[PDB]
């Protein structure tokens, strides 16, 4: 299965200055739960943002840099290489990867951040005419998690 994994706000902002615009520990827990034991594919900027491969899953980085050879990371140089990756593969970002893959994936695990943030990078527009809501779950709010959010699983119709 090939899936998108993304958190975006009410206006589809995903990032600002190579970081996330929000602090939301529960979304990181969600990412951990979904992708542990599986594969993440990310663009080079997203990788450099996170700084190191995420533990307990396969980290694959897409880059044109033929000098990229980082410990604990697999490298690919073409979108086409993604389709040769075994198992459950999650497209992990960023904007460029999401733009290249939204028409290709089977489903999407979206955390809708129910706020309006300043962004410089966006998830591409999409319509519920194309996507079935397999599940929609409101995130619980507390002292550490203060922004309303909804976990959506969308499956291509
Ligand atoms: N909210 C979220 O769910 C989420 C998730 C991830 C990231 N983000 C945010 O997204 C932003 C980064 O997005 P971005 O679009 O600037 O960067 P990106 O997608 O992370 O990385 C772009 C880089 O990926 C490589 N790449 C992409 N397609 C390629 C292809 N077909 N062939 C070869 N290389 C390819 C290139 O690397 P080279 O230049 O090295 O060739 C390109 O410059 C940041 O703000 C980050 O915080 C948000
Ligand atoms: C730059 O992105 C991050 C920085 C620090 C911690 C976590 C993230 C990060 C990266 C990718 C993500 C992705 N594809 N989906 C969701 N729902 N959350 C993410 C969070």
From Swiss-Prot:
The keyword NADP applies. One of its GO terms (molecular function) is dihydrofolate reductase activity. Pfam families: DHFR_1. Residues 1-156 form the DHFR domain. The keyword Secreted does not apply. One of its GO terms (cellular component) is cytosol. SUPFAM superfamilies: Dihydrofolate reductase-like (SSF53597). Its EC number is 1.5.1.3. GO terms for biological process: dihydrofolate metabolic process; folic acid metabolic process; one-carbon metabolic process; tetrahydrofolate biosynthetic process. It is an enzyme of class 1 (oxidoreductase). Substrate binds at residues 5-6, 27, 49, 57, 92. It catalyses: (6S)-5,6,7,8-tetrahydrofolate + NADP(+) = 7,8-dihydrofolate + NADPH + H(+). InterPro entries: DHFR (IPR012259), DHFR-like_dom_sf (IPR024072), DHFR_CS (IPR017925), DHFR_dom (IPR001796). Belongs to the dihydrofolate reductase family. There are two DhfR isozymes in S.aureus, this one is chromosomal and is sensitive to trimethoprim. Key enzyme in folate metabolism. Catalyzes an essential reaction for de novo glycine and purine synthesis, and for DNA precursor synthesis. This is Dihydrofolate reductase. It comes from Staphylococcus aureus. The lineage of its organism: Bacteria, Bacillati, Bacillota, Bacilli, Bacillales.
């Amino acid at each position: 299965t090939l899936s998108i994994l993304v958190a975006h706000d009410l206006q589809r902002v995903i990032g600002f200055e190579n970081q996330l615009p929000w602090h939301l520990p529960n979304d990181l827990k969600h990412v951990k739960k979904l992708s542990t034991g599986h594969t993440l594919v990310m663009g080079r900027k997203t990788f450099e943002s996170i700084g190191k491969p995420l533990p307990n899953r396969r980290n694959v980085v897409l880059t044109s840099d033929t000098s990229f050879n980082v410990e604990g990371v697999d490298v690919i140089h073409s979108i086409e290489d993604i389709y040769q990756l075994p198992g459950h593969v999650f497209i992990f970002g960023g904007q460029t990867l999401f733009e290249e893959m939204i028409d290709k994936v089977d489903d999407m695990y979206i955390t809708v951040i129910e706020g309006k943030f300043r962004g410089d990078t966006f998830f591409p527009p999409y319509t519920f005419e194309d996507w079935e809501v397999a599940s929609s779950v409101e995130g619980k709010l507390d002292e550490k998690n203060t922004i309303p959010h909804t976990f959506l699983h969308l499956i291509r119709k």
